Design a protein around this motif. Structure first.
Motif, mmCIF file in Angstrom:
data_model
loop_
_atom_site.group_PDB
_atom_site.id
_atom_site.type_symbol
_atom_site.label_atom_id
_atom_site.label_comp_id
_atom_site.label_asym_id
_atom_site.label_seq_id
_atom_site.Cartn_x
_atom_site.Cartn_y
_atom_site.Cartn_z
ATOM 1 N N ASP A 135 60.426 1.669 44.357
ATOM 2 C CA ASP A 135 61.600 2.506 44.328
ATOM 3 C C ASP A 135 61.527 3.504 45.488
ATOM 4 N N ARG A 136 62.621 3.628 46.230
ATOM 5 C CA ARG A 136 62.654 4.553 47.357
ATOM 6 C C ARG A 136 62.623 5.978 46.824
ATOM 7 N N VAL A 172 52.377 2.747 47.929
ATOM 8 C CA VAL A 172 53.562 2.508 48.757
ATOM 9 C C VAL A 172 53.604 1.118 49.346
ATOM 10 N N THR A 192 54.477 -0.972 52.205
ATOM 11 C CA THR A 192 54.773 -0.921 53.640
ATOM 12 C C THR A 192 54.943 -2.339 54.202
ATOM 13 N N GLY A 201 62.168 8.267 51.610
ATOM 14 C CA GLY A 201 62.344 6.936 52.151
ATOM 15 C C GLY A 201 61.287 5.966 51.659
ATOM 16 N N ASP A 202 60.056 6.452 51.495
ATOM 17 C CA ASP A 202 58.960 5.642 50.954
ATOM 18 C C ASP A 202 59.265 4.921 49.630
ATOM 19 N N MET A 203 58.780 3.685 49.503
ATOM 20 C CA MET A 203 58.981 2.896 48.283
ATOM 21 C C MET A 203 57.745 2.950 47.408
ATOM 22 N N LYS A 231 63.836 9.524 46.890
ATOM 23 C CA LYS A 231 65.061 10.209 47.241
ATOM 24 C C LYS A 231 64.709 11.626 47.666
ATOM 25 N N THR A 243 62.995 9.416 42.647
ATOM 26 C CA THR A 243 63.385 8.169 43.311
ATOM 27 C C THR A 243 64.867 7.904 43.141
#
Length: 170
Positions: free
Chosen positions: A132-133, A99, A101, A116-118, A135, A83
Motif C-alpha cells: 500500500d502506498r 517496502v 522496491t 509514495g513508498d509501498m 499517503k 496509506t
C-alpha cells in the motif's frame, strides 16, 4: 527490540479472532499473578506464563505465533503513517516497515520511509501480500508510552495497526 516500539493504540491480532490495543493487552497481563514483571530505567517487561497467541507473517502466509514477552517503554518521538488504502500505525522512528522496491522488498526505518513508498500489509480476505502506498507520514514530539511484543519464530514479523500492517520488530 532495538528501540523498536509502537503506540499503545496499536491493534494487535490474536488468534482467537479478537482484536486488542497493545496498551490494554499490556495492562491486563501486567496484573496477572501468573506473570513476572521486571522494571528498570523507564523500561518494563512482562514475561507471560501463557504465551499470547498472535499472527505473524511469513513469506506469503499468515502463521500463528506465540509471544512470551511484552515491553512498555518511553519514546519522545512517534512516526504516524497513513496509506492510501486507509491503513495506519504510529511507531518509534527506529521501527521498520517492509517496502516493495524495483529491486524487491527491503526493510526500512520509519524515519527513512518516504511518502509514495509501498508498505507491506496483509489482506483480510486470504492474507494476500498487499503493498500500500503511504499517503502521509507525520513526525510528532511528545512523552509517549510505547509498547512491543516478541514474535519468536522463523518469519520475525508482526501484524498490527489499522489494516494489518507488517512490522519488523525482530
Amino acid at each position: 527490540s532495538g528501540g523498536k516500539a509502537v503506540s499503545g493504540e496499536t491493534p494487535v491480532y490474536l488468534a482467537d479472532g479478537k482484536t486488542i490495543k497493545i496498551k490494554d493487552l499490556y495492562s491486563s497481563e501486567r496484573k496477572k499473578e501468573d506473570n513476572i514483571v521486571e522494571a528498570g530505567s523507564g523500561e518494563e517487561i512482562i514475561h507471560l506464563k501463557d504465551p499470547i497467541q498472535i499472527y505473524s507473517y511469513v513469506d506469503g502466509t499468515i502463521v500463528r505465533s506465540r509471544s512470551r514477552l511484552l515491553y512498555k517503554g518511553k519514546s519522545s518521538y512517534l512516526v504516524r503513517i497513513e496509506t492510501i488504502g486507509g491503513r495506519s500505525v504510529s511507531v518509534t522512528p527506529v521501527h521498520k516497515l517492509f517496502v516493495l522496491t524495483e529491486k524487491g522488498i527491503e526493510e526500512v526505518m520509519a524515519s527513512n520511509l518516504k511518502v509514495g513508498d509501498m508498505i507491506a500489509a496483509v489482506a483480510e480476505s486470504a492474507s494476500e501480500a498487499t503493498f500500500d502506498r503511504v499517503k502521509s507520514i507525520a513526525y510528532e514530539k511528545g512523552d509517549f508510552d510505547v509498547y512491543d511484543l516478541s514474535v519468536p519464530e522463523y518469519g520475525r514479523n508482526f501484524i498490527g495497526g489499522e489494516g494489518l500492517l507488517v512490522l519488523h520488530n525482530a
